[PDB]
Amino acid sequence: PLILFNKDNNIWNSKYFRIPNIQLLNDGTILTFSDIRYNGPDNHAYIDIASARSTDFGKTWSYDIAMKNNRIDSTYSRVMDSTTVITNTGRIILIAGSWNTNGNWAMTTSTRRSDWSVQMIYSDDNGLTWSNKIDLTKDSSKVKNQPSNTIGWLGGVGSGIVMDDGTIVMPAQISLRENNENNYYSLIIYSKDNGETWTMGNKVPNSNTSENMVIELDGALIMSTRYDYSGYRAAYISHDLGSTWEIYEPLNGKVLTGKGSGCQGSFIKATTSNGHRIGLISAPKNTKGEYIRDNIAVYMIDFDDLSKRVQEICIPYPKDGNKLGGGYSCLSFKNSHLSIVYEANGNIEYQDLTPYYSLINKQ
């Protein structure tokens, strides 16, 4: 596997890389992102977000800094946990959480986190140049239906989707102040104006849910979310663009995540040659438990053949993750090509999983 972001050899001399992201462009361009964790693996540290671009199918990469933190705190200023999407116009949107203090983003403060904000950048030139950082939460002109008891929120860490009519849907996670407690939930946000303004959906029926991704299936939204301390990835379905949610049985609890806290994963849809709509999930098996997060595997479900059980297709990273921070992955499928980026002992590796999709396509 090619080392995309190397902790031992990078142009920023960063000691650690975390939270990968990948987008397969329509013309074959591969666009990837990752946290630039300069001082180490800690989440509450000095972090920017990088971009690696390839015009030769992953052989050579051009590196840049897509987003910088607010530059306020040389120790804690950070923009992190990227959530990306490609609109129908080709516009590439990146959504990230922004902080500059110490402490968990969801549990530290009992009121709205003062240094918290959601920053968004977009590129109209296929990832060559990026726009200015646009604050989505400093006022109320960009995001509608933001709960008043919001401690903070950010993207679902991964990739969004585009509906039939062109509506962009982004996975999201929110922390809410409810009855002297801080409960965090998963949900979605959507934009009908190419990402200029957004409307916030409602929370999923269960707390302790966070990082997630949604797919579109015949107008509905099917979510595969991180369900902490449940041992599995939860799944919900929505028929009103994320306003109401029901448990999606065919996927709920099917992907096990081992003991301890959950872990981020990716959930994308692919349409095989026989017309079937399949779901591809990447997540560590975590058979060794807790934050070890071993064996980043790729699972498959056939929505048009739901009697067939979820299949383990391959394990792109059949090793233990680093307990300091690992296990995150992101899949991207476009034009019968499948690619993955994942964390690998402080590094970010890349793989082309297209031959495995060809085994699925049965052509």
Residue numbers in the entry: 20 to 382
Pull text from the paper.
The genomes of most C. perfringens strains contain three separate genes encoding highly conserved GH33 CAZymes targeting sialic acid glycosidic linkages: the nonsecreted 43 kDa NanH, and the two secreted 77 kDa NanI and 129 kDa NanJ. The catalytically active domains, which we refer to as NanHGH33, NanJGH33, and NanIGH33, displayed differential activity on various naturally occurring forms of sialic acid. We report the X-ray crystal structures of these domains in complex with relevant sialic acid variants revealing the molecular basis of how each catalytic domain accommodates different sialic acids.
The 7-O-Ac group of SAc3LacNAc also projects up into a preexisting space in the active site. In NanHGH33 loops on 3-blades forming the rim of one side of the cavity are extended, thus deepening the active site. The center blade of the three has a solvent exposed tyrosine residue, Y310, that projects into the active site. In the SAc3LacNAc Michaelis complex this tyrosine packs against the galactose to which the sialic acid is α-2,6-linked, providing additional interactions in a +1 subsite. Presumably, a similar interaction involving Y310 occurs when NanHGH33 binds α-2,3-linked sialoglycosides but in an as yet unknown but more favorable relative orientation of the galactose in the +1 subsite.
